[PDB]
Design a protein around this ligand. Structure first.
Ligand SMILES: Nc1ncnc2c1ncn2[C@@H]1O[C@H](COP(=O)(O)OP(=O)(O)OP(=O)(O)O)[C@@H](O)[C@H]1O
Lengths: 107, 806, 144, 48
């Protein structure tokens, strides 16, 4: 894998820790640029707990790298994502995913 | 979007100062963020036009333009040699923030529809004085020149002393001291030589314009006397202006029209000389830097300076008349600007097709804010955007710029409007008639009939329609608020006519003729162009042939034709790192695809361009050559030198047939057909061309994931023009394999029904958004600069065609 | 003007004398406006003045005007048409039923000075009878 | 790639000062120009 590029800076001090809930807004696009998912569209932040394997490896590591209040672009390879199987109907097999992720707060 | 490295990278956030610098010499565009260099530049871009600062945005921003001087306080000093942009405001305009190519504008009574704007060209700033070097001054005019220089200097000094200029050793505006305020013979050599040259230039341009000048009275020269001037007009050194009196002389209107041309020519010659010397234009005068406020071509010059020059030249011609030389104005000669095609020049706004009315009596109003070219009336739903309103049978309109009624031609009708006049358009479909009223009075034809049109067949229906020429503004009132109509009560209410949108709970949707060229399928009934789908024989692949139906006949249409195949080939997301029988493994494993274009004998290859176009090509250029192609190099580098990437981006990749034309064959009609093959490697992003089986030097490189449409730009020269051959070569797959997934491993050439030829159409109907972003622009202050604010969100649901990326 | 036009429509001799006068004197009715019945000044001046007559009548009176025209087609005299309207005053159109009457009423009541109009049933019958007679005779004139 | 795609997008508009500069042979215009833009307020996500 996962590559992180800081779109906007964060506090730079608070970072997610294992077993700590992370609240984010994400917009997911395929490497071609086609959008397939976005929490801003649903208007509800996505909350997930690190270390529980609730999200894929790319989210795990990339969001662990990000700091509170930071907006970043995450590039996640197929191996670090749904991979060969993919997500039938949404993500084509063997696809790289690009996510615009803002880490709102930690709870 | 190409990422560019900069210290502390982040998306534009509050308290960020973006400094943009344009160097037109390289040419290059460079950026600085908070005073830190942005490690990336644009360069080698097209210079066919005028550049302006621009900021694009969605709702939810507040930004400020800092243009230097009094219109903005630069936070960071401009890089050496770069001028503040506020210096580029033209003499006749005041600096302000404006939208770009708006077709709609808010108004007091309601929204205003706006026609296309007139844009200056980069060539409009090139002074073009008439060629006078060929003319040789007759001696009688030479002697008059000798005195004309002095007399012009006398008038100059008279004006200077009248406005308060006084003599001095050095020239300074505040001191009001002028060194050249001396006798002409005592004038410094350079200025005196320039004055003599200009005085001779006046006579020489008089001759050049076609005017005739010839001595009439010798005694007039001896009769002329210089006017005595008072001691106040007498100069500190002792010099006195001595302009010869011309109270007796009189000027004809034609002579004044000629004086206007003389002043324009003189100013243009002066501007050309100063440009040659190295001067340039600036809103603020800087003599040490060779920047002048008046160094612009005459047409763009300020009104006051124009009047001053006209007065000077009128006095000069008066001096010639006083000397007695008869001057014969030359007759005006016809001249047509033909700047743009009239059919596509005017923007047409119509009601949506679903609002067409097939019965009843309907009324609406059109207020003409300007007095220029505007048409208003009723159009049928199938109205074409390229054709002018009323030129065909689709629309019945009124053009009150000159007072004509337009339907299948123009006839005199009514009278022209002035500014603010309201034209009420009325359609009675029970009587099949159309009526036009100006300011509540029914316009009458020459015969005296009240109805403008008669015996109208209902057909599909009728829709309100207007057409605005360049620079015109009109307010269309469809009557949703009946009290808003100004003359409905005076005329129309009692006659039973009803407002068009009287009982409509929402504003009527409108469609305007957008002038963005678009690729559309060739019509199956096109009068001039025919496309034939030919099956692939044993020795021939599938083909799409273009033929000119009307070649070599009256009404034939010969113009540049831009053609593309409907389906694109898309390059792979990731590029590879670093007999005549196909080999079963190479053909299956190859990523190269090939398609050819056959230019038929009799079609000049010099008029054919063959290649590919991205989904972004929108140039309907009548005079097209490869120089017109858009192209820009984006260069990423390190914080010091060390260029890292030099990518080139363009929308058109093509080769000219003149390159493959043999030098001996050039200038002669060729019996042979010319086959230009194009190969694309979808894995390596490399594009190559072959001519008659010979590799060409031209080659192109494209970034991964690029979409490319096979394309041909041709100026027809024969009944048979070109043929898209969708074939293949040894170990190169056909084009259908790239286009279609199901045929990705099929080496047999195919031309499925979806694949077809499409031609570039100049204009197309486009829906006008019901709501528009509210942008507030205002000058915050002398130091704060100008300010743009947009705070109210506005969204739309967009339907996207995957293949066309539109 | 409507009374004069009504006399023109009723009397055949008036029409023939107007036709003669214009023909012998070579008058130019087209020049006057800027022969055929349309060019006739008697009908043209009415056509010009009629919008004021319609302005008198309120939009509710459209049905009553239609009925009065029907009576004039029945050839009823003006007084008995007046009595017919007087006894049938209730039939005046209902604004609620038709949307058009709503936006017509908007303008009619918005224009100052006409709020007092329609207050008097005698006034209503006056205006309806007059405008109906004028419209009826104009219909006969325009019919070939 | 086959079915038409739909999505909600923001409206975007452009604003310029009435300043036009270009290069041509014999032109009267200067070749180097410079300006600045200061960002006072920005909402990263006013909409989706
Ligand atoms: N702005 C102008 N427009 C038209 N003609 C001009 C202009 N400036 C100069 N000329 C021509 O050149 C002559 C100027 O001569 P000269 O070189 O002696 O003037 P200068 O003192 O250098 O000018 P300035 O008045 O700008 O100080 C004018 O008489 C006219 O012939």
């Amino acid at each position: 894998g996962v590559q992180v590029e800081t779109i906007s800076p964060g506090d730079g001090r608070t970072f997610p820790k294992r077993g700590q809930t992370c609240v984010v807004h994400y917009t997911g696009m395929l490497e071609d640029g086609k959008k397939f998912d976005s929490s801003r569209d649903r208007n509800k932040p996505f909350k997930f707990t690190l270390g529980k394997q609730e999200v894929i490896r790319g989210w795990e590591e990339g969001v662990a790298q990000m700091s509170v209040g930071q907006r970043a672009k995450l590039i996640i390879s197929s191996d670090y994502a749904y991979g060969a199987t993919g997500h039938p109907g949404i993500i084509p097999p063997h696809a790289t995913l690009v996510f615009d992720v803002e880490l709102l707060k930690l709870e | 979007a190409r990422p560019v490295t900069s210290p502390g990278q982040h998306l534009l956030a509050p308290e960020d100062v973006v400094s943009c610098c344009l160097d037109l010499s390289v040419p290059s565009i460079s950026f600085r963020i908070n005073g830190c260099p942005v490690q990336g530049v644009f360069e080698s871009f097209n210079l066919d036009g005028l550049f302006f600062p621009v900021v694009s945005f969605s709702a939810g921003i507040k930004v400020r333009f800092l243009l230097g001087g009094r219109h903005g306080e630069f936070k960071f000093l401009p890089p050496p040699g770069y001028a503040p942009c506020h210096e580029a405001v033209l003499p006749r305009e005041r600096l302000h923030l404006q939208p770009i190519k708006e077709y709609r504008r808010e108004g007091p009574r309601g929204p205003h529809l706006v026609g296309p704007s007139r844009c200056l060209s980069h060539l409009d700033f090139v002074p073009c004085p008439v060629d006078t070097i060929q003319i040789v001054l007759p001696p009688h005019l030479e002697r008059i020149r000798e005195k004309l220089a002095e007399n012009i200097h006398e008038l100059w000094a008279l004006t200077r002393i009248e406005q308060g200029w006084t003599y001095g050793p050095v020239r300074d505006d505040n001191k009001r001291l002028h060194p050249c305020l001396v006798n002409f013979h005592s004038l410094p050599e350079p200025e005196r030589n320039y004055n003599l040259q200009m005085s001779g230039e006046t006579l020489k341009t008089l001759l050049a314009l076609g005017c005739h000048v010839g001595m009439a009275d010798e005694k007039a020269e001896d009769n002329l006397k210089k006017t005595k001037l008072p001691k106040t007009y007498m100069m500190s050194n002792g010099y006195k202006p001595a302009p010869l009196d011309l109270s007796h002389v009189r000027l004809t209107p034609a002579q004044t029209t000629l004086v206007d041309r003389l002043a324009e020519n003189g100013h243009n010659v002066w501007a050309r000389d100063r440009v040659a010397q190295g001067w340039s234009y600036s809103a603020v005068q800087d003599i040490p830097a060779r920047r002048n406020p008046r160094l612009v071509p005459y047409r763009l010059l300020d009104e006051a300076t124009k009047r001053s020059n006209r007065d000077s030249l009128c006095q000069a011609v008066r001096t010639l008349l006083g000397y007695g030389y008869n001057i014969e104005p030359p007759d005006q000669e016809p001249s047509q600007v033909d700047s743009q095609s009239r059919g596509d020049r005017a923007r047409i706004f119509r009601a949506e097709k679903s609002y067409a009315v097939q019965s009843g009596r309907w009324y609406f109003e059109f207020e003409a804010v300007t007095t220029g070219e505007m048409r208003v009336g009723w159009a049928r739903p199938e109205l074409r955007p390229d054709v002018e309103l009323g030129a065909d049978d689709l629309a019945y309109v009124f053009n009150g710029h000159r007072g004509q009624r337009w339907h299948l031609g123009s006839e005199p009708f009514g009278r022209p409007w002035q500014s603010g006049d309201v034209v009420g358009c009325m359609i009675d479909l029970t009587e099949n008639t159309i009526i036009f009223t100006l300011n509540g009075e029914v316009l009458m034809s020459d015969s005296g009939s009240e109805t403008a049109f008669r015996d109208i067949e209902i057909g599909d229906g009728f829709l309100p329609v207007c057409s605005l020429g360049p620079g015109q503004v009109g307010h269309l009132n469809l009557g949703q608020d009946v009290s808003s109509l100004r003359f409905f009560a005076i005329c129309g209410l009692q006659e039973g006519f009803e407002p068009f949108a009287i009982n409509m709970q929402r504003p009527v949707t409108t469609w305007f003729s957008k002038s963005l060229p678009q690729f559309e399928p060739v019509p199956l009934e096109h009068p001039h162009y025919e496309v034939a789908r030919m099956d692939g024989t044993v020795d021939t692949p599938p083909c799409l042939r273009l033929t000119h139906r009307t070649w070599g006949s009256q009404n034939s249409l010969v113009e540049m034709l831009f053609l593309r195949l409907s389906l694109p080939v898309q390059f792979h997301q990731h590029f590879r790192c670093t007999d005549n029988r196909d080999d079963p493994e190479i053909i299956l494993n190859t990523t190269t695809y090939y398609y050819s274009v056959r230019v038929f004998a009799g079609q000049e290859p010099s008029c054919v361009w063959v290649g590919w176009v991205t989904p972004d090509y929108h140039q309907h250029d009548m005079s097209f050559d490869l120089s017109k192609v858009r192209a820009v190099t984006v260069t990423m580098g390190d914080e010091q030198g060390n260029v890292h990437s030099s990518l080139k981006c363009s929308n058109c990749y093509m080769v000219w047939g003149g390159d493959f034309v043999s030098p001996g064959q050039q200038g002669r009609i060729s019996h042979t057909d010319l086959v230009i093959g194009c190969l694309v490697d979808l894995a390596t992003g490399l594009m190559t061309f072959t001519a008659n089986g010979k590799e060409s030097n031209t080659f192109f490189q494209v970034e991964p994931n690029t979409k490319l449409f096979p394309a041909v730009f041709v100026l027809p020269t024969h009944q048979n023009v070109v043929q898209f051959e969708l074939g293949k070569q040894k170990n190169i797959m056909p084009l259908s394999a790239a286009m279609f997934l199901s045929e990705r491993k099929n080496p047999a050439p195919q031309c499925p029904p979806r694949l077809e030829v499409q031609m570039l159409m100049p204009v197309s109907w486009s829906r006008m958004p019901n709501h528009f972003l509210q942008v507030d622009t205002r000058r915050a202050g002398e130091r704060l600069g100008w300010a743009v604010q947009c705070q109210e969100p506005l969204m739309m649901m967009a339907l996207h065609i995957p293949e066309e990326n539109r | 003007v409507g009374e004069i036009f009504i006399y023109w429509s009723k009397s055949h001799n008036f029409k023939r004398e107007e036709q003669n006068f214009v023909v012998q004197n070579e008058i130019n009715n087209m020049s006057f406006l800027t022969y055929s019945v349309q060019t006739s000044l008697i009908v043209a001046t009415l056509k010009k003045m009629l919008p004021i007559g319609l302005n008198m009548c309120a939009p509710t009176d459209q049905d009553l005007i239609v009925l009065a025209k029907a009576r004039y087609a029945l050839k009823d005299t003006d007084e008995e048409v007046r009595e017919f309207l007087q006894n049938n005053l209730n039939l005046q159109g209902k604004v609620e039923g038709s949307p058009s009457l709503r936006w017509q009423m908007a303008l009619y009541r918005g224009v100052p000075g006409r709020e007092e109009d329609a207050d008097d049933p005698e006034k209503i019958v006056r205006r309806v009878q007059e405008v109906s007679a004028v419209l009826y005779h104009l219909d006969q004139t325009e019919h070939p | 790639e086959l079915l038409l795609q739909t999505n909600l997008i923001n409206y975007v508009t452009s604003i310029r000062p009435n300043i036009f500069v270009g290069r041509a042979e014999g032109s009267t215009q200067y070749g180097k120009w410079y300006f600045e833009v200061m960002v006072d307020e920005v909402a990263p996500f006013l909409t989706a």
